[PDB]
Amino acid sequence: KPIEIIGAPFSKGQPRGGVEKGPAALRKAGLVEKLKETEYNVRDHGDLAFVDVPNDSPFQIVKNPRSVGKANEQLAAVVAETQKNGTISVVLGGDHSMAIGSISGHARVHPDLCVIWVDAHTDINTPLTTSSGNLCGQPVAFLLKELKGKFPDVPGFSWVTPCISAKDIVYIGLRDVDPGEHYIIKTLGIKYFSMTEVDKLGIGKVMEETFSYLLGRKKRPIHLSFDVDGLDPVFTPATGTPVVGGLSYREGLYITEEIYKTGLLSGLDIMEVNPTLGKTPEEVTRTVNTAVALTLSCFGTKREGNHKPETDYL
Amino acid sequence: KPIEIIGAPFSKGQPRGGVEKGPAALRKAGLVEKLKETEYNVRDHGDLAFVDVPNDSPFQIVKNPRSVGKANEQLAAVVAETQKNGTISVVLGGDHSMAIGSISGHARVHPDLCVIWVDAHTDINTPLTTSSGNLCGQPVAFLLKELKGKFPDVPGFSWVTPCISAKDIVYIGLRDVDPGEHYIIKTLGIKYFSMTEVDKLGIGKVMEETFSYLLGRKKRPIHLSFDVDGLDPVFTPATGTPVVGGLSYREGLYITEEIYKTGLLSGLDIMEVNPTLGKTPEEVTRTVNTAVALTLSCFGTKREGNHKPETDYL
Amino acid sequence: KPIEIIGAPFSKGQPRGGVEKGPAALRKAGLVEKLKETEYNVRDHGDLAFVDVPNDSPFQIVKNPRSVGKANEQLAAVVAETQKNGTISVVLGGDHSMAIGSISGHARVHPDLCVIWVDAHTDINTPLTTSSGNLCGQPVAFLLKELKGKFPDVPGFSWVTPCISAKDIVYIGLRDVDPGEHYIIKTLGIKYFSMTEVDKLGIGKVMEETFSYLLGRKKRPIHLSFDVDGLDPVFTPATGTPVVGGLSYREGLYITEEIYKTGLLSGLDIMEVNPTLGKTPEEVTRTVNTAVALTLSCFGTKREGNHKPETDYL
Ligand SMILES: NCCC[C@H](N)C(=O)O
Ligand SMILES: NCCC[C@H](N)C(=O)O
Ligand SMILES: NCCC[C@H](N)C(=O)O
Ligand SMILES: [Mn+2]
Ligand SMILES: [Mn+2]
Ligand SMILES: [Mn+2]
Ligand SMILES: [Mn+2]
Ligand SMILES: [Mn+2]
Ligand SMILES: [Mn+2]
């Protein structure tokens, strides 16, 4: 199945800039070229051009609502189209608010999809529970059916239609959840494996349970939304909201290796790589290389190694 | 149940100074204020003032015996009193010799208590087996009933009465045990999970077994004596005796989260944070923040998040 | 059973120099003296003197073939002799090409031996599959019976006779395997636990399975060939080919503790410690100390502690 890379250089979902440079940094490291060495056919859609909405005043506490809503409507259209042609979409972020468009467009073609969200955060604050008003911490709230009508309609998002139920998403890596968010995930009965569960079970058991929960009853497309801050700051330091005690480099690759093995990956997001936030050049290189490795892992690259079929190396 | 913070700025149990500054460093980081945000009622007893015993000559190889014995007698009295009023005592060290007074005072009110000792060391050397004579490496020897009469009475400790049996203590994190200490824990049949057992079982299984061993037969108060060097030097570098290959930050919090969940925590010690031993200011900040996080974890703070009851955040 | 330390200061198996200084660095850290504190009788054979073969032109792509082949023939002779006298050989590298001589000499006395290869690499490239021509990445190819006749006879190695079968070796730590190597290990059905398997199973289960696979049917001598780059660069940075996401310090010691417990260790290699590759003096000290700890672990040193028999420490 073909792969289509879609750059989403957008940072309006955040208070500070820099994450819009993520796609460029990833390409600079040769992500596209490296992906072409895998078993998949790769196509680069390029980077989307986003139109900044003039006089985009705050909707209550929410910041840049129209700009964020517009960027996501455009991304959703692009993703829906690539999905329609039967190709796996790979969105390079960009802040996590872009998951609204990515998942929305994906669901237009595969409404029965499930979501595996790797992040130190739930990103499920609503316009009413958010303390910052930053849309990068509210993606999931705009996507969940059970949250529909629980907050006022935000300018620029009227095109959004809640596509997934609280039962179709699984969080992995949680360790920085706001009171309101914790109330929401507990009240909605959302399935999650915070770092506490990862420590208890081991990443091996976490993936077994994640798959039995989401796929045990029926096999459906998987949308993996990977926020780089899900891994410990020691591995991915160049990111907006680093939180200590995260997933290790090994655990991140294990997650992606297992997702690859399911043969169900249909959509992927590689978010929050902010090249301007490295304390040193090396911290940026470290973060970019990790994001690249995770992406290649999603598409076949295994740590035990790989070799071409019908080729007698000896 | 109320919480009472007791500072024990004492370093005579060690050859070098600096650890007496631990309580100050912990408070500076806002430990007290942060604890007040938990579900517990918090009271700060302040820092105990210790009277240095004049001409405190060495008892054989043992150093500062009278000063250490006197400081611990005072701490035991203070702890016994807070325990008597039904409050959970939290001792901020200070070197680990202060566990003598902390546990002794605790046992005066809850004689059926059990001890979970998180440390890279057993701290079970007796005045006869010690190679250094430092009392910070001998706490447990003064507390165990089975060791009573196995060493000469040390000046300043005649007030001490062995309160716990070798069967009421569980070590977690061991990786730097002297020959004599190893002989003692094996000969006394003390239950332990050295790093070898943690690697084999995983911290999840270690806590299950620790609880079944200490609480399976009967539920009793838990005294958690946490030496910061139990965690790997990468997490808590500013400490007197760092040892490579320790518990991770995640594992330390898992331990404390599980202890919180038992609902049996009755006494706590946060020891060996020495602010003068950081190779850089950041290593000190790293160590203090970790100690603070572990303390908050013992009192309810969970990585999956927390929220106030009877509060509709939506 | 006696122990005999054999230094192999050789670096011709690699493109760059420096690893020949490994034995010196290890001794400088007091490896020999520390080993004498264990339960084993220790003898130091000293460092072998290798004769550089003049005009050692490349055999096709292979570099320094005659020099590498000659050094290994000499090492094999020395190892065979120590093995003959019933002593455990401990080879200090030196680049991993020296495993050819170490294992070859070992097999002359214990032809039924098995090999546990801890490395981030398989080092199984043949003179035809190698992209570099460096012999440090081809040791196993010269040792495997199934690879006999799969590549042209290399000058300087005519003395070598494939001694082990693909079924007598187990890899642990793999995470950087070339396409050709992956083709070879899959085609030959070699047993391995790449980092993916370690993440899935946990090091505890990995060792159980390694032993059931190699020893379940019959107990035989164990040859442990330990490449320091098997551990993550955070623990052993001063090495030629560091690869992120490796075994932890704890896991490395667990491996060695378990091998010690089998009572079957017959030959040991401590390879790839290159003192010239530390980014700082401390990174070198860190690498050397780790190699020393692993070696002592192989001979009895346990993290739970150790004490002398027939000695009443109390
Ligand atoms: N991704 C960071 C999220 C932080 C906080 N939950 C917020 O909603 O602002
Ligand atoms: N806490 C460090 C202890 C070191 C050694 N066991 C001693 O008793 O001096
Ligand atoms: N030990 C490093 C090996 C790297 C590569 N497999 C090679 O054969 O050159
Ligand atoms: Mn996040
Ligand atoms: Mn996120
Ligand atoms: Mn200690
Ligand atoms: Mn201690
Ligand atoms: Mn290697
Ligand atoms: Mn090697």
Please, what are the domains in chain A? Answer: 1-314 (3.40.800.10)
Q: Are C298 and C266 in contact (CB under 8 A)?
A: no
* Cβ atoms of C95 and C218 closer than 8 Å: no
Which helix (H) or strand (E) segment holds residue A3: the answer is: strand A3-8
Q: Which tokens hold the place of C65?
A: 């073939």
Residue A244 has its nearest CB partner, among B204, B249, B306, at B249
Q: Judge if the beta carbon of residue A93 lies within 6 A of ligand 1.
A: no
* Cβ-based burial of B271 (10 A; exposed 0-12, middle 13-18, buried ≥19): buried
Helix ranges restricted to H, C144-248: 179-187, 195-201, 203-215
The phi, psi pair for C146, rounded to 5°, reads -65, -15
Please list the helix, strand and coil fractions of chain A in percent, rounded to the nearest 5, in that order: 40, 15, 45
Tell me the technique behind this structure.
X-ray
CA A143 – CA A166 distance, rounded (Å): 9
Give the full edge-to-edge strand order of the sheet including C169-172.
Answer: C42-47, C3-8, C88-93, C265-271, C222-227, C114-118, C169-172, C191-193
Q: Residue for token digits 């009933």?
A: B145
Q: Give the C-alpha separation, C158 to C176, whole Å.
A: 29
Amino acid at B35: L
What is the crossing angle of helices C249-262 and C281-298, to 10°? 20
Contact B276, B21 (CB under 8 A): yes
Measured distance CA(B252)–CA(B241) in Å, rounded: 18
A249–chain C Cβ distance below 8 A for any pair: yes
Measured torsion, CA atoms of residues B7, B13, B18, B24, in degrees rounded to the nearest 10: 0
Identify the residue whose tokens are 């006749």: C149
- Token digits of residue A157: 């998002």
Task: Give ligand 3 pocket residues (Cβ under 6 A).
Answer: C 121, 123, 125, 130, 132, 134, 136-137, 178, 241
β strands within C199-279, DSSP E: 222-227, 265-271
CA B118 → CA B6, B112, B202, B207, C80, distances in Å?
20, 20, 15, 12, 47
* Closest alpha carbon within chain B to A121: B304
Is C87 in contact with C2 (CB distance < 8 Å)? yes
CA dihedral A231, A237, A242, A244 (to 10 degrees): 60
Residues in chain C within 8 Å Cβ distance of B202: 202, 204
| B261 interface with A at CB cutoff 8 Å | no
To probe the interface with C, which of B176, B196, B235, B280 has the most C CB atoms within 10 Å? B196
Resolution of this PDB entry, in A? 2.0
Taking the C-alpha atoms of residue C105 and residue C91, their distance in angstroms, rounded to an integer, is 12
Cβ-based contacts of B200 with chain C (< 8 Å): 203-204, 254
Sign of the four-CA dihedral C139, C140, C143, C147: negative
Could you identify the atom of ligand 3 that is nearest to the CA of residue C120? Answer: 1
Please check whether residue A257 touches C, CB under 8 A.
yes
- Going by C-alpha positions, the residue among A296, A269, A299, A267 that lies closest to residue A84 is A267
CA distance B122 to chain C (A): 10
- The three-class DSSP label of residue C306 is coil
Q: How many CA atoms lie within 13 A of B133 on its CB side?
A: 12
CA atoms C134, C135, C136, C137: torsion sign: positive
The shortest CB-CB distance from B203 to any of A174, A177, A199 is to A199
Structure tokens at A93: 């972020």
- Please report, in range form, the residues annotated as the binding site of B: 96, 119, 121-125, 132-134, 178, 227, 229, 241, 272
Q: Does C302 touch chain B (CB under 8 A)?
A: yes
Q: Are A71 and A98 in contact (CB under 8 A)?
A: yes
Can you tell me whether residue B120 is helix, strand or coil? coil
